Amino acid sequence: SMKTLPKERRFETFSYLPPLSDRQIAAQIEYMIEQGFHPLIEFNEHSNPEEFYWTMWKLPLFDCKSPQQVLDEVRECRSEYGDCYIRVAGFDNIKECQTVSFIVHRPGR
């Protein structure tokens, strides 16, 4: 009873899961806060795997002990750039690597 796998563009981590509810998004941002990672919102007109850089929304949220504060920035960013992909990333400054990364908004249509 085998299906042939559909071709579908993906967006790295969590993009094979059914889309994150806002509660699931907040659970991931809570994890960041607890882990001590600094949230950063980035947006891009495209999702090309080859490109290294998306555009930074404001600055990283360095002083953040509040998932809603992150969620507010995502809402605000999505308002200004609903035509764009928006992605939440966590940054570990001790190992200096981005530890978390998932798309929270794909562009309209």
Binding site: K3, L5, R9, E12, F14, Y16, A27, Y31, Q98
Partner: protein, 467 residues
């Protein structure tokens, strides 16, 4: 001063056993587990090891007095008997920084493990650990890239990476090889890979494989929107032939290649690691033949030494075992050498098999690769054991899916992401792993088919390599 040549055989323990010695921070320290032959005392056995692995031979030579032997000789500075083992001891031996060629793992091995293992006066010998002093660590390049730079290069964050070894090991043509590669990668795996004994053979010559595989990477990447890679095996009969193969991989813009560091050797591997650094190609290190050396706990070299030697010689990935899979891996010591291959500072901890505190002076970590006899049911354990900074590899666990490669790849990628989400949310992968998997199988039919297929398959045997 050096005064008085007296010809003839003396006891090694006269010159080489120095229980009052306190190791300098520039000393290379080795821990050996040995059993002396009957009537050979432990301290004379330890001193024989220190002697023949540094400066000494079997009689007195006058040439010693031309130099300053106190400053060059190895010093068996401590012996302790193994708790509960009869006639088994640890010798701890210090070696001066001066004894070693800078940046040469080949030379370090030739000294420490060159001859002493075949001493008639010794029944069995096993090197457990080496404390590489920071002054020596800094003469090596290390990983071409290492964990952080690799994730940045590939845009891969927030999870273990997923690979797949193409099967059968041997027999497929270059075209069918790339076929299997395309279907795996399009299904959601980050990497595919040559099996370690795919080099260049009558049924499939290497340049043909590189060419068809490059095409499969471009296609599957264009389709999925994620960076894809395939560890092309450049392991070869000669340096020249190895470079040739590495060069064509670069020409094709392949992000990652593969090398068998033990069967090819540390001299060739160090050449390749340097090349990779200069050419921005990632280096996956396969550990073929390691178990010939590291399996039995009475004789050989423990893998955690080989892992430290490779971090020095250079590799971006290294196979670390699965613990839970078809090949042997003790969990305690595996957590030990994964720390040794990943972290910058690892405290001594004998419960993890870590005999010496190791510092890496900011030398990049090596991604551990869990590969061998693992499938979807193992996923929560693999994530819990290794964490994000790992590559989990499913050969039969992808190509043996009922519906083929792409469904097989989706099953694993879904299983993985589910486990990572559950973990981030605070679920216990240990307790809730099968439930997290069954939940995900509710909405992923290809995952469900894999869970069904491999429900009964466990590998549970007595581990020979006990701490």
């Amino acid at each position: 001063s050096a005064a008085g040549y007296k010809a003839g055989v003396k006891d090694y323990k006269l010159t080489y056993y120095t229980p009052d010695y306190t190791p300098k921070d520039t000393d290379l320290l080795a821990a050996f587990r040995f059993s002396p032959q009957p009537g050979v005392p432990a301290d004379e056995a330890g001193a024989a090891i220190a002697a023949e692995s540094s400066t000494g031979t079997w009689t007195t030579v006058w040439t010693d007095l031309l130099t300053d032997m106190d400053r060059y000789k190895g010093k068996c500075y401590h012996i302790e008997p193994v708790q509960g083992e009869e006639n088994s001891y640890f010798a701890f031996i210090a070696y001066p920084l001066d004894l070693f060629e800078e940046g040469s793992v080949t030379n370090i091995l030739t000294s420490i493990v060159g001859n002493v293992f075949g001493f008639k006066a010794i029944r069995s010998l096993r090197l457990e650990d080496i404390r590489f002093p920071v002054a020596l660590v800094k003469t090596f390049q290390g990983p071409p890239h290492g964990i952080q730079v690799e994730r940045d290069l590939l845009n891969k964050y927030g999870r273990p990476m997923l690979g797949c070894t193409i099967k059968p090991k041997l027999g497929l043509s270059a075209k069918n090889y790339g076929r299997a590669v395309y279907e795996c990668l399009r299904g959601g795996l980050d990497f595919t890979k040559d099996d370690e004994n795919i080099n260049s053979q009558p049924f499939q010559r290497w340049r043909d494989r590189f060419l068809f595989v490059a095409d499969a990477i471009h296609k599957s990447q264009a389709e999925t929107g994620e960076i894809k890679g395939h560890y092309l095996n450049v392991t070869a009969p000669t340096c020249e032939e190895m470079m040739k193969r590495a060069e064509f991989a670069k020409e094709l813009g392949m992000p990652i290649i593969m090398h068998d560091f033990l069967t090819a050797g540390f001299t060739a591997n160090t050449t390749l690691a340097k090349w990779c650094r200069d050419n921005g190609v990632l280096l996956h290190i396969h550990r073929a033949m390691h178990a010939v050396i590291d399996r039995q706990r009475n004789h050989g070299i423990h893998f955690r030494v080989l892992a430290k030697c490779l971090r020095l010689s250079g590799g971006d990935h290294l196979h670390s075992g699965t613990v839970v899979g078809k090949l042997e891996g003790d969990k305690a010591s595996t957590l030990g050498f994964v720390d040794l291959m990943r972290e910058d500072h690892i405290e001594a901890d004998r419960s993890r098999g870590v005999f010496f505190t190791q510092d890496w002076a900011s030398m990049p970590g090596v991604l551990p690769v869990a590969s061998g006899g693992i499938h979807v049911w193992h996923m929560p354990a693999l994530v819990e054991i290794f964490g994000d900074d790992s590559v989990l590899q499913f050969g039969g666990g992808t190509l043996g899916h009922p519906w083929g490669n792409a469904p097989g790849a989706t099953a694993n990628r879904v299983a993985l992401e589910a486990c990572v989400q559950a973990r981030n949310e605070g679920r216990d992968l240990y307790r809730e792993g099968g439930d997290i998997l069954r939940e995900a199988g509710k909405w992923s039919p290809e995952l469900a088919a894999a869970l069904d297929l491999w429900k009964e398959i466990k590998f549970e045997f007595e581990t020979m390599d006990k701490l």
